[PDB]
Amino acid sequence: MDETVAEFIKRTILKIPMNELTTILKAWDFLSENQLQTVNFRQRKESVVQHLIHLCEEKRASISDAALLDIIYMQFHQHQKVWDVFQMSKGFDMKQFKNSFKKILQRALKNVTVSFRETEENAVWIRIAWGTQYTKPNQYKPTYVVYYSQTPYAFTSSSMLRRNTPLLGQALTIASKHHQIVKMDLRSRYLDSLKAIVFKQYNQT
Amino acid sequence: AKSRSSRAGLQFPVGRVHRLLRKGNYAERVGAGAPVYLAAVLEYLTAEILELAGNAARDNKKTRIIPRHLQLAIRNDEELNKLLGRVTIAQGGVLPNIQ
Amino acid sequence: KSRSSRAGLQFPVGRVHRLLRKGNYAERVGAGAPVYLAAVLEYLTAEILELAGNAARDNKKTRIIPRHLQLAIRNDEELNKLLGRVTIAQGGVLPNIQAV
Amino acid sequence: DNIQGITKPAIRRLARRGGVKRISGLIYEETRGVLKVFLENVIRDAVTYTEHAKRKTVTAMDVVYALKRQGRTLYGFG
Amino acid sequence: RDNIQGITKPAIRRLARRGGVKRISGLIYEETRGVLKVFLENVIRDAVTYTEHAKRKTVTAMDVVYALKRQGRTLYGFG
Amino acid sequence: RKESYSVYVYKVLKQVHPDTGISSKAMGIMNSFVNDIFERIAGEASRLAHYNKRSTITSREIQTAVRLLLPGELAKHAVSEGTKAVTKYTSS
Amino acid sequence: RKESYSVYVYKVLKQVHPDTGISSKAMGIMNSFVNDIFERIAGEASRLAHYNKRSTITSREIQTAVRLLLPGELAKHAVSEGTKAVTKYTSS
Amino acid sequence: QGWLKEIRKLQKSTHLLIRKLPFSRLAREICVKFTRGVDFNWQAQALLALQEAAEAFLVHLFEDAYLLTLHAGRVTLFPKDVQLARRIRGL
DNA sequence: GAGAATCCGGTGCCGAGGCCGCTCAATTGGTCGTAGACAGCTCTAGCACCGCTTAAACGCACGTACGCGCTGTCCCCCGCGTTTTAACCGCCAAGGGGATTACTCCCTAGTCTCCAGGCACGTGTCAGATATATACATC
DNA sequence: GATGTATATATCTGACACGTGCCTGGAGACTAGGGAGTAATCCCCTTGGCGGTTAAAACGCGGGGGACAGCGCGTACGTGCGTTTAAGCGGTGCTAGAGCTGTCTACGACCAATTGAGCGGCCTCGGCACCGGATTCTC
């Protein structure tokens, strides 16, 4: 394998606390539980991740599995980031949506990285790593989209890298079966308040 | 409720090889540890020849394996040429060999 | 009453059937096969030993030695293609001489 | 005819693949000859299998098995 | 101390006379001593395996006959 | 306790020849001949019990194996002799 | 209803390579590769169940068949990998 | 020159160097002469299989027999070369 | 020092990979006969060695029969341009038989039981091996 | 014309064809249950043909490129012959090693329920094959 994704997985697991690292690695579903039994969970963190990488040196790795680990890490640290709320209008399986969004985005720019994850209430967590037409995509400044199939609403993570916001908006509007995209005032830290302020109005229109 | 290849830590199947090695009439008694070992050997051989094929595939700026890439990855390597000596790969062609 | 004498053969039939049961070749062995097999083996054995005995007779010796089988195989055309990848102990070669 | 379909530029391209620089003229008979004495030993060694499983159709597996028994193992077409 | 020169300068000549060669050259005496050696490896490494499998320190004749049959050059006369 | 095929080759030789003796070494060659052809034919016909998805070896499979493993005229004489043996085996 | 080995070769290729696709014809070659090596080794090891007058095929006979049917360095890597698979199969 | 481009071209592509229907009519003519009277159906993949085997065999034969023309100092093949190349193997 | 070879871009197209329905074959689990690992004892046949002895290799000197580079001659494939031709593509009909299922039946397998054949052992004795001596074939 | 070249026999030497005892694998018998051979069927894969094009093969021609034949120098190889070294006989010892006879146990066939891993059908969309364009190379 390449010698770039190992630093990413090491940095991501170094960001994970010891309180639920076994929960992350059981939910990530990538290594054998015998190899979970082999790893000492009592020494310090600066060698546990070395042993886990040395497990992942041998068997399998990618950028997609590291991205899905990053998605599961971001799903349990919603207190950190600050979210944004969008909505589409002017107008269903999710497989065609995934293919359409990928294609579109890969036809828009040269180098992007897209990753999906299925979650209940028909939720999809979409990690986007932006790039240019000459550079590698920056994995360390992602952009996360919480999209629902039923509601036309989408939760948007802020990032350092702007200027791809209307490109992502139009590519997701064409990628969906829609024509318009809005940008409300709703920018807050916790997802449940945005969830309530959307769903109290949408379920009771 | 639990897979045989998952205990084996492999990717090729184990029950199918054991089924063929019983139904092929090779011996009247089949030891249990044999087809796991045999499937690991087959996995290493296919892994070696595809690992040699993919480098020549990226050498020709391609990502889809055609039989010409397998022909070159067999004939350039020495030990696989010792193994696959009397085999004509279909749609293969020959090495660039002049004088 | 023996199955060798019942079919009018000379090679055994029970031993060939024993080697087809315990040879791991198929799960069931018919009865019409090993008599056919022993007949074919008897014909091939007679085919070799006729030429071997004639070549032994033409060398004025009353005993068969492996040089005579070497000459009989390498002078016959059919056994040259049947036994084309065969070395024979105490063999020797054909008297091959060639000039420019 | 039914043998002159293997024309002169066909055998010429078969030689130019093999690295042959300059070709003589009599080759264009002997090669055809050896081509026939190849294909016969593939045909009947195929068709006996076709006469065993009592069908009037030569499958591709029959030709692969005839070449298997002949010595030149063929891949792919199985 | 020479260990391959037990093959002599005229034993190769006797094998070439049996083959029917009128006049050997020079460095053939240094060439054939290579080739034979290579061939013996592809018997003996192939014949030490079978006798390793049957827990026998004795390399019988049947083992060499089986190895020569597996190489392709079938030998009859022994057994 | 370790069987061979010497007696039968000796009987065939005394059948098709009056008094031609055979040495004890060349007879060994005949053993390694006819422990070999039996390894081919009754090996290879087993393969024809596998391509057609069967489990038996009848006379027909041995007949086709003889049609394959032998060159022309020798195969014709062998297939002409074998059924001649089988037909006088059937009406026992 | 007529099985093959396409899915497993595809999984191994996606393991040791990120996105290198394989055509539907060359995959067929891989079928006739690995319906062939299995015919050699698990054929030839059966022969070693017959010379030693046995009736089983354990891991040791397959190990010796791999020692025979492969040239040197590839055989060394294969025998080093197979027992590594077996030892983590035993302590299940 | 010319031939130096053709060797570089034909060793690159992996086509069929023999046309389909003459080879098929030749294979059917050979198949008629054995076990006469009845015809024989051919699947469309089997003739392609036999054509690939025959092309690989003839290319390997010419490439093997060419090395007995550089050895004699010549440049050009001869039927002596091909017959000697078959004499060496034992086919 | 400019037609030919190499890299590049645009566009159609079509097969490669993702997805769903499903079914049958691989898993799990408990039972029992037995194949073979394991130990120990017994005959045998392979290795080490040595003295002899002698047959063959070893080393060399030399004469000379091919190896090889050269060169002259003559013929003979290859590139080129024109004419001809059959291979192929796509279609359209049709039909021969390949694959599937049913059903009975029959023929081989297993186990028991009885004894005739094929193998190990032993022995006189003829076939040839080698050796010497003597009648033909020859550059 | 002496040097091989084939033949007479000397005898001597041991393998081998043969005779006997004998252990065990082959024959007789018969049940039973799966393998398969026969019968029907329906589709599906192959065969035959119409037709039009377009690459692809056939044919003259001339010209250089190469094969072939002679030839001289010479050097690397065969041969003759004395030596000296290592190979064979054969004989002793003599012990590691095949093998084979019991045993007991872990182990793999054998079998009933059950479910998901993998196979068949489908549908794109990006990878790729081809077509046309811009940048190098030797005669």
XYZ file of N, CA and C in Angstrom, chain D:
234
model
N -10.238 -26.095 -53.825
C -9.090 -25.729 -53.006
C -9.235 -26.217 -51.574
N -9.792 -25.338 -50.734
C -10.010 -25.520 -49.297
C -8.718 -25.741 -48.513
N -7.568 -25.431 -49.109
C -6.314 -25.299 -48.374
C -5.582 -24.014 -48.715
N -5.890 -23.376 -49.842
C -5.265 -22.135 -50.262
C -5.857 -20.913 -49.576
N -6.747 -21.102 -48.603
C -7.175 -19.991 -47.780
C -6.075 -19.479 -46.875
N -5.116 -20.337 -46.533
C -3.948 -19.913 -45.779
C -2.966 -19.351 -46.794
N -3.116 -18.072 -47.117
C -2.431 -17.506 -48.263
C -0.990 -17.152 -47.916
N -0.288 -16.598 -48.904
C 1.085 -16.144 -48.691
C 1.227 -15.029 -47.652
N 0.444 -13.930 -47.653
C 0.640 -12.942 -46.580
C 0.195 -13.417 -45.210
N -0.664 -14.431 -45.128
C -1.014 -15.003 -43.832
C 0.190 -15.680 -43.190
N 0.867 -16.550 -43.944
C 2.060 -17.215 -43.436
C 3.188 -16.210 -43.263
N 3.195 -15.155 -44.079
C 4.197 -14.111 -43.933
C 4.027 -13.359 -42.622
N 2.790 -13.023 -42.247
C 2.570 -12.373 -40.959
C 2.829 -13.321 -39.798
N 2.513 -14.609 -39.968
C 2.860 -15.596 -38.950
C 4.362 -15.708 -38.757
N 5.137 -15.480 -39.810
C 6.583 -15.497 -39.653
C 7.106 -14.190 -39.067
N 6.570 -13.048 -39.516
C 7.032 -11.755 -39.022
C 6.687 -11.537 -37.559
N 5.670 -12.223 -37.037
C 5.500 -12.216 -35.592
C 6.643 -12.957 -34.915
N 7.120 -14.030 -35.528
C 8.154 -14.839 -34.919
C 9.559 -14.287 -34.964
N 9.759 -13.091 -35.499
C 11.078 -12.509 -35.557
C 11.880 -12.858 -36.786
N 11.289 -13.562 -37.747
C 12.003 -13.947 -38.958
C 12.212 -12.720 -39.828
N 13.465 -12.450 -40.181
C 13.759 -11.291 -41.015
C 13.397 -11.541 -42.477
N 14.016 -12.540 -43.097
C 13.912 -12.753 -44.534
C 13.474 -14.185 -44.790
N 12.435 -14.354 -45.601
C 11.750 -15.635 -45.760
C 12.050 -16.186 -47.141
N 12.272 -17.496 -47.230
C 12.446 -18.144 -48.523
C 11.089 -18.408 -49.166
N 11.079 -19.211 -50.223
C 9.866 -19.396 -50.992
C 9.185 -20.734 -50.808
N 9.953 -21.775 -50.500
C 9.374 -23.111 -50.398
C 8.631 -23.331 -49.090
N 8.854 -22.451 -48.102
C 8.222 -22.522 -46.783
C 6.709 -22.577 -46.910
N 6.172 -21.803 -47.859
C 4.744 -21.691 -48.127
C 4.095 -22.992 -48.577
N 4.859 -24.053 -48.828
C 4.238 -25.365 -48.935
C 4.347 -26.156 -47.640
N 5.560 -26.233 -47.078
C 5.833 -27.146 -45.971
C 5.053 -26.756 -44.729
N 4.949 -25.446 -44.480
C 4.133 -24.929 -43.388
C 2.683 -25.360 -43.526
N 2.125 -25.253 -44.741
C 0.773 -25.740 -44.974
C 0.690 -27.223 -44.686
N 1.716 -27.965 -45.121
C 1.799 -29.380 -44.812
C 1.825 -29.638 -43.322
N 2.655 -28.879 -42.590
C 2.759 -29.176 -41.172
C 1.504 -28.699 -40.464
N 0.830 -27.686 -41.035
C -0.433 -27.231 -40.472
C -1.465 -28.337 -40.528
N -1.502 -29.068 -41.649
C -2.441 -30.173 -41.763
C -2.079 -31.283 -40.792
N -0.780 -31.579 -40.657
C -0.398 -32.677 -39.772
C -0.433 -32.226 -38.325
N -0.695 -30.941 -38.072
C -1.098 -30.587 -36.725
C -2.579 -30.858 -36.520
N -3.421 -30.312 -37.410
C -4.836 -30.154 -37.088
C -5.543 -31.488 -37.018
N -5.092 -32.451 -37.827
C -5.614 -33.812 -37.781
C -5.477 -34.408 -36.387
N -4.305 -34.242 -35.766
C -4.110 -34.777 -34.422
C -4.847 -33.998 -33.345
N -5.525 -32.909 -33.689
C -6.376 -32.219 -32.737
C -7.813 -32.628 -33.023
N -8.121 -32.934 -34.289
C -9.516 -33.159 -34.664
C -10.018 -34.486 -34.123
N -9.332 -35.589 -34.447
C -9.867 -36.886 -34.046
C -9.751 -37.086 -32.539
N -8.678 -36.568 -31.930
C -8.576 -36.521 -30.477
C -9.648 -35.649 -29.843
N -10.246 -34.727 -30.595
C -11.453 -34.078 -30.112
C -12.661 -34.983 -30.293
N -12.841 -35.510 -31.505
C -14.165 -35.972 -31.902
C -14.515 -37.302 -31.251
N -13.510 -38.028 -30.747
C -13.764 -39.231 -29.964
C -14.556 -38.911 -28.707
N -14.216 -37.801 -28.037
C -15.032 -37.323 -26.923
C -16.441 -37.003 -27.389
N -16.557 -36.416 -28.582
C -17.862 -36.137 -29.158
C -18.598 -37.423 -29.494
N -17.872 -38.483 -29.837
C -18.572 -39.736 -30.047
C -18.836 -40.474 -28.751
N -18.253 -40.038 -27.637
C -18.527 -40.755 -26.403
C -19.832 -40.282 -25.776
N -19.885 -39.015 -25.385
C -21.152 -38.394 -25.033
C -21.943 -38.213 -26.316
N -22.997 -39.010 -26.488
C -23.601 -39.248 -27.799
C -24.352 -38.005 -28.263
N -23.589 -37.040 -28.763
C -24.145 -35.825 -29.328
C -23.404 -35.500 -30.614
N -24.081 -34.782 -31.505
C -23.533 -34.442 -32.808
C -22.796 -33.111 -32.811
N -22.438 -32.585 -31.644
C -21.930 -31.225 -31.543
C -20.610 -31.213 -30.794
N -19.583 -30.646 -31.415
C -18.273 -30.507 -30.796
C -18.283 -29.242 -29.951
N -18.224 -29.398 -28.636
C -18.166 -28.225 -27.786
C -16.737 -27.708 -27.706
N -16.581 -26.524 -27.113
C -15.246 -25.955 -26.953
C -14.444 -26.712 -25.910
N -15.128 -27.284 -24.918
C -14.451 -28.069 -23.898
C -13.824 -29.324 -24.484
N -14.399 -29.858 -25.562
C -13.814 -31.027 -26.208
C -12.477 -30.695 -26.848
N -12.375 -29.529 -27.484
C -11.112 -29.143 -28.100
C -10.084 -28.796 -27.033
N -10.531 -28.182 -25.931
C -9.621 -27.892 -24.823
C -9.100 -29.183 -24.201
N -9.951 -30.202 -24.095
C -9.510 -31.474 -23.533
C -8.608 -32.240 -24.489
N -8.833 -32.110 -25.800
C -7.933 -32.739 -26.761
C -6.556 -32.099 -26.731
N -6.496 -30.779 -26.576
C -5.199 -30.119 -26.452
C -4.559 -30.378 -25.095
N -5.375 -30.609 -24.064
C -4.872 -31.030 -22.758
C -4.159 -32.366 -22.857
N -4.798 -33.335 -23.507
C -4.184 -34.646 -23.668
C -3.007 -34.590 -24.639
N -3.032 -33.654 -25.587
C -1.967 -33.567 -26.581
C -0.670 -33.051 -25.970
N -0.762 -32.106 -25.041
C 0.418 -31.590 -24.379
C 0.419 -30.085 -24.226
N -0.194 -29.387 -25.174
C -0.225 -27.927 -25.187
C -1.477 -27.472 -24.455
N -1.339 -27.142 -23.175
C -2.499 -26.766 -22.378
C -2.979 -25.377 -22.774
N -4.276 -25.254 -23.015
C -4.896 -24.001 -23.420
C -5.718 -23.453 -22.264
N -5.587 -22.158 -22.002
C -6.366 -21.507 -20.965
C -7.455 -20.649 -21.594
N -8.223 -19.984 -20.739
C -9.174 -18.994 -21.197
C -10.509 -19.535 -21.660
N -10.483 -20.434 -22.637
C -11.695 -20.849 -23.328
C -12.473 -21.923 -22.582
N -12.017 -22.283 -21.390
C -12.775 -23.167 -20.529
C -13.952 -22.445 -19.902
